[PDB]
Amino acid sequence: MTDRYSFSLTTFSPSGKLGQIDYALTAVKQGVTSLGIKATNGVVIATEKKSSSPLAMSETLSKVSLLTPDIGAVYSGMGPDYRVLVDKSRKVAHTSYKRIYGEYPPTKLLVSEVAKIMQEATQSGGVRPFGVSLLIAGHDEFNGFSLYQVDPSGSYFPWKATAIGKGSVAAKTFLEKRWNDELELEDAIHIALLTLKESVEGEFNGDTIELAIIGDENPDLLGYTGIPTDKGPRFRKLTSQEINDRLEAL
Amino acid sequence: SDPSSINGGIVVAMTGKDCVAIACDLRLGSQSLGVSNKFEKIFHYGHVFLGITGLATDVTTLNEMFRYKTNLYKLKEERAIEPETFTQLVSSSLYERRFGPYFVGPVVAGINSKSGKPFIAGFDLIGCIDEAKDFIVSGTASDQLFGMCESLYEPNLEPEDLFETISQALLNAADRDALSGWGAVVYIIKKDEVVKRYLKMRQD
Amino acid sequence: GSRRYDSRTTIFSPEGRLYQVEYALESISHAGTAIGIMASDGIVLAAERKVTSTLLEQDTSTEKLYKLNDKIAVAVAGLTADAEILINTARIHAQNYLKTYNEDIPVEILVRRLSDIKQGYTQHGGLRPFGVSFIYAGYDDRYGYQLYTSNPSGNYTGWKAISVGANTSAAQTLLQMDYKDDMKVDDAIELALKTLSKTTDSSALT
Amino acid sequence: TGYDLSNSVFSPDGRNFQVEYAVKAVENGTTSIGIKCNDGVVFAVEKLITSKLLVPQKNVKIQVVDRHIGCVYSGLIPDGRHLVNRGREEAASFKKLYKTPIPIPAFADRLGQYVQAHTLYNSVRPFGVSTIFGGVDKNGAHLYMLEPSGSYWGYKGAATGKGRQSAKAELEKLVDHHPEGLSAREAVKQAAKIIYLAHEDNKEKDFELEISWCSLSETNGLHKFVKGDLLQEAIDFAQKEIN
Amino acid sequence: TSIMAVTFKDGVILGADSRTTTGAYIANRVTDKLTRVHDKIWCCRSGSAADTQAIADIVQYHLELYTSQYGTPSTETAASVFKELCYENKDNLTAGIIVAGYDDKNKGEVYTIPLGGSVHKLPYAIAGSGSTFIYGYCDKNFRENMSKEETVDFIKHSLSQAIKWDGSSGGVIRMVVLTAAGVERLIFYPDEYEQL
Amino acid sequence: GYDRHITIFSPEGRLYQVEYAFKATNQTNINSLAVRGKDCTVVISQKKVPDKLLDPTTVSYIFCISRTIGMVVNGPIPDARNAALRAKAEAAEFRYKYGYDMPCDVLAKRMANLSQIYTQRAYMRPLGVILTFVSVDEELGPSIYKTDPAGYYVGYKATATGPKQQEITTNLENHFKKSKIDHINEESWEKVVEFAITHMIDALGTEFSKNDLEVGVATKDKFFTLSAENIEERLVAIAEQ
Amino acid sequence: TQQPIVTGTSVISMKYDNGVIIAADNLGSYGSLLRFNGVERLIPVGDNTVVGISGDISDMQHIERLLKDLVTENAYDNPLADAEEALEPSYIFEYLATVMYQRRSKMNPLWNAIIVAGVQSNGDQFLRYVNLLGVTYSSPTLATGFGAHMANPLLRKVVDRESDIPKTTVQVAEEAIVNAMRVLYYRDARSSRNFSLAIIDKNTGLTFKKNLQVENMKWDFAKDIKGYGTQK
Amino acid sequence: NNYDGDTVTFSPTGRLFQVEYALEAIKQGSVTVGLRSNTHAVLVALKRNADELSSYQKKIIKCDEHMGLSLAGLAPDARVLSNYLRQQCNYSSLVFNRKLAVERAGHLLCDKAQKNTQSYGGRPYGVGLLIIGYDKSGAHLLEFQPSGNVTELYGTAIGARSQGAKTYLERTLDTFIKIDGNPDELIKAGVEAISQSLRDESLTVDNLSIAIVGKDTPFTIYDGEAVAKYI
């Protein structure tokens, strides 16, 4: 063959610009808005699903993917890119930290690992950056609850609150104004519903709005009963019915 | 014959009230030539303590392997490697040479500083976790220690009641084993201080 | 075809240095003011963070100061993304040496190494250079404290006081004046902070 | 407009200009025809003898694969041999694994996919041939034609070259006069008829007729070239009609 | 260890024992050595159990590709896939497999692949260390192209002897009727023919 | 210029190449429709065979990935054949590793992941075809997943492809709102085939013969195609309605 | 390495002026259980060569595939080239020797004993031996396995030197082979009743006669000679 | 134009420009003409030398007892293709006891030329070779074109001013085929041909090189007082 694409194609410009990283943000903006609010006793993350035909089962498309039972992920930007990364995350976590240390990674560590893949993929030629920006919300014993934004440049940064997507800027000013140090999960939920409505004109109903949490303990879904001090899944996607009840308190 | 018995020697570990203690003989030989009385089998990386039995050259290599891995752990995660995590890392590593295995027997000791749980662990060549909090023993005279330790020990021993118990337990058995003796070190590990005590005893 | 995009990406300008290096220099400089001051009895590392909000949690964030070991630290000026890679490499490389000789590696060999990785990307391959300048602060008994800066050109030099990022010019001036041989840790802290108070492109210094 | 400078890549047309020009070279090539017969298949080809200093019946382009496959080609001559050689290594592997002469639908896949691997990329250029191939196996008559594009189906009859227009119209007449399909032995006189009529399109330089066939049992489930007496008959019958 | 495939008029019937021993201990006596790999081709397993399990899973996958791309494997076609693997990996894999199937067109066919591995088409085949006894009985009392009922009876009769003479052999006669009607599993308790 | 041809980022966001994959689809002009029975999954396709030069029977749009999973393709013929080979390999490999046939959904996901790889890599290109996997999985019953050249995918309870799908898509929405039922729930396989064919006839506005249809039917653990003669009988039932 | 599983006992042969006669028992013996009967072990390739193979049935069929490849490779491209540069027995013999060579140096033999019998385009009698020990030599009479030790001296009684090839005719050779198959059967335990016989002339081609059976065993001494020693 | 740099990209016409230039190179080089009868093949080639000081350079090289080639066009590329053939001749001969046929050898070079036009950044060889041989099937002369077309021919000529040779070849076509059993007369006919092809730079005793292989003629190159005979 010969493939002459090894050479960087994210080459500097005369003003130091990184052409492909700048363009990737464009795909992010066409995303449907997602947001994350961190409280003292958990994390809530929220989004509206991508539009689809009614005829299509809307259960299948899910923008919130469980990556480990303790760490969930939600994105804004392209759909195709997200999937490949999600497999890749589950993969690298088992091989390198669940065979060695027998445990799902620490939350900052998983973010560090994803970030390298994004750095090579933008450094190296012939592979365009991922066109997605992630919010990885997780828990770990060592750093407590955490929320991190992962950019396609592969920089990752902790935020009290943030939003990515269409209306990321507007939503950030909103979230700042309602951020408190007495926040609860419940207070946070309230805010997320206000934010989401302002930024999305779509219909608000439990079958197309995702609300998913890092924080409820589940001895119940532990899947086994035999030592309850195990934390079990932190992740829970709220069930439709429950969601509907809280839309009374939109 | 056995690679373990070139230097032989023993390591003993027990748990006490919010303490552990780990001790060992200082004897190092190459067969019937006693070389050194200054050799240490017990090393420390933070609050995780590791006495290693068996083939002397394999001990120095294992220490080094693990010198590297434990520091890289401390730097990236910004925290000492728990006894808990460490035991796992130990088990994976022994496994690495599945066949032609490592000829060494690690014994872990430490205090999970994050909860206050006394912790000790054992291992074989292939590496499996041998969990038993009352005691873990190892080496060429592991047989001898077992009788002694089970009888001396009474569940939940006071910090310095634990000190009498470990010290005697080692002393009696070690002279009565030809690949053990030549003094001892007794590490009394409590949460807020670690004391290191060379013990007066017959070198014979 | 496939040869239409390629055009001898890695070729010297008439001067003797790739255009690309310059451009990468431009990028690093966007980053805030970083000061390292070498003294008889220690080194002061201080840096002012830019490209930042208070909404972004700054009580945990890292874009400056990373621990390489006890005696050796960096201050980063450049892409957090380009930096992350190097800090990892520098850590494993130091660790290998530590294990091999059970003596800390010298500072001079640490710097030389990282520098070759840089050179690699422009010598061949056509890969754009890595936009990082690090302030290396170290101690060994051989030379005392040692203070280096290193460039994306992969050059490195010895310094007694230096700045990279914004207002490197204005900061360098004051420092030379203030540098003395009887200088201690405690003076360097005050000195740096007064330099920083003036070079700030932020509202204030916080 | 830059898709004409980039080998096999999607475009607003969808079909790349390179894949399109490869068809143009096939078209300048010699007439090639294929008849699906009742109990076999007959491949015939116009071989244009530019000069008399070509050795008759020695430049032959009927390439054998296995003991039952005949293939014949128009287009770029290097591209034609390389696909057949490559097909032989593949076929040999299948017969080893499964100890069976390769089926025609089987072999059809071997040939097609080699082309596809080179349309996916722009590093590697794809074939510019249409190859008429087929023979008799346990599943019956099979007459195929593969494009430089990489699309194939069965054919009651296939045609390509400058005189493909002559070929195609008479091929349809044959299905009309024979809806049960004209038999393998009678078809050999007809094939020669079509070639001659097709020679009017290609009349500037002389031809030499060259026929082969694979048949269930007329050849005795073998591959043979139509030669001697049979060849001779087919010469007379053909001439006699264009006169 | 008693396994056979025996052709008849309308196809072919497989019969096998179930008792599988490790040592003098009967390891498992509900084993199913008649095994599925394609709808109408099944396989009789004998020899080291491990080696035979592993190969059956690898060929199976191949068979599924065969169907999809090159049409249904014949019994001949399938047998050939076993022959290859066991020849090349003679020492590693010691596996003696009878591969037998019913085509509609070509009728019941029996092919046996040795440890060494080499195809034989044979009208019928009999194998196993506990089934030595019934080489004499079987050959002598073979009636070619049996009635279907006669083919069932025939295997039952032979197997009464084989269990008598051999302790390793024992348990239910597990059977697969490979006919146009497809796959019919039959089971016959050992008690009915050992005592009677 | 360059950013169009290779699969690096365009200033818009969307690759020129993925859009080009859809336009190319439109040029075959062959329209496929998928609905679900209670117990079956029915595919009918237009079948075009213009002259006798090309043999009728060989024209196909159906590929048997395994003994159970059918696939209908909408779009170019070479590309379909290529994608078809890969999918057969995947399905098998999953049997080898796991001891059972790949579910319809899992299979679709795998292809979408591949699709992604072709749109990052510069010399690789996204396929011009659209892959619609159908099955009736044992456990879960009827299964429709449609996979795109992007690799964007979702499940369905009925879908239609071809350049003239727009008509079919609205007619399907209207029919299924009225009935209410999400999908045809007739137990009988024969009824769902009559319904599918009749519905197409309304939607496109153009009547068909047996010759103009090609009918695939999937039930549990099995894919099979209905013979010509059965399809004639199916038309007698339609004429009678 | 290779441990013998299933094997054939013997292939027997000689020369005469217009060709060669090669015959062989047809048998796959698996230990002392004679598991496969009537495994044919002569493979005609064309009408000018027959390859008679003894040893492993396992390896014999692996060699068969290669035999298949040999014909196709010749037939490939122009037919008129390989008409008049047809596969001689020499071409097949060489091809084979090479494959074996490689395998056994790496300590994994292709475990067979072969006699390649034919007549050239020239018609020259070609008879040569190649086996798994890599020993390769031509001889007027040849046989492998048991048949070397037993059958072969009869054949050798008739043709002794290279000057006795013209003198022998086809008729004489055939009677000689036959007489020897009888003896052979009598005195070999691992013999099959069933045997095939091949005559290759460069004037009539191959006549293959299959499924001949051995003639009545001689039993004159079975009914007189009793006991085994002192005791009865 | 634009299809001259690229090899992977088909010209609109569908005939690559590199291949048109490769053919161009054949024309600038030495005249060489080949012919065959039934019992022999005969090659005539013009030896070249840069200057008076330069000794004349043989262009026909004996490859094997049954094979040899002449080159017309670039000399460097000829060397690659010719080494290749020696290896293949010998390999085949060792394995099968079967001499590499002329017909088969031709396909090998062909598939090889294909790979470098397929692959982006390769180049066709800028050279033609007339490969002659005598084997049991008969005498032969094969034409290797850099276009990948292999043809058996009674006679052909390539090189500069090939035209004199070409009219001579048609004319003498039937005559040289019934000449057999005489090498000497066949070789004379070739000399007649080459001197028509030349205008200026007359042949002398070492400007001429001849090769002949035949039934009873091992592949021999004739030069000096040997070709004095046939002048």
Add this chain to the structure above:
Amino acid sequence: TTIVGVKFNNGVVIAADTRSTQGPIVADKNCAKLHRISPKIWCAGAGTAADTEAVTQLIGSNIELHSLYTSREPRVVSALQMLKQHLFKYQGHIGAYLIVAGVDPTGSHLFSIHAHGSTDVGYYLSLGSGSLAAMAVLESHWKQDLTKEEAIKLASDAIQAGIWNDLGSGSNVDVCVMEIGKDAEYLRNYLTPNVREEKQKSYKFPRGTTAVLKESIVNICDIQEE
């Protein structure tokens, strides 16, 4: 070492001793032989205990990946197959013996797998060096269509027969019950029989009975300022 598994109508029951042994030296008087590949596939090891612990972990990782990816509960068949292959790669050097018991969407399952990689279906199966004492009890008590209640009984009894016979057995007897579609109930320490005779008299030393050369505070925390 005694393990029994007995499949029943409503789920599949695994039970095992907790005395773990390395030679006639009891390594751990009590330590669960019951281990988890996953909450719906529990397993126990016989043979080289070391080998078992490891291989469950390694393979069990792959299974989690498959499990997430198919978006189904861990499948008994998927795990079993994977393991078979891995052993086979070494030709069964791995000294592993596992009872692979679990629930999945297709019902309740029990299988064996041996060091060479032999597998068998069983309505009841047994592994260990006390496999033979345990198995006797089952075949007698057994009837068609055990209930949940009955399956507890047979499992407890069979391990209890092994205490008297096999020496490696002894101490606590644990049971776990894996029900279809339902959380796995660990009845850890299902039986607790009496171990360890209370001390006849002290052996605890008076103070001052040891002789100590020196003591020194040795730091272990990261260096801190004064």
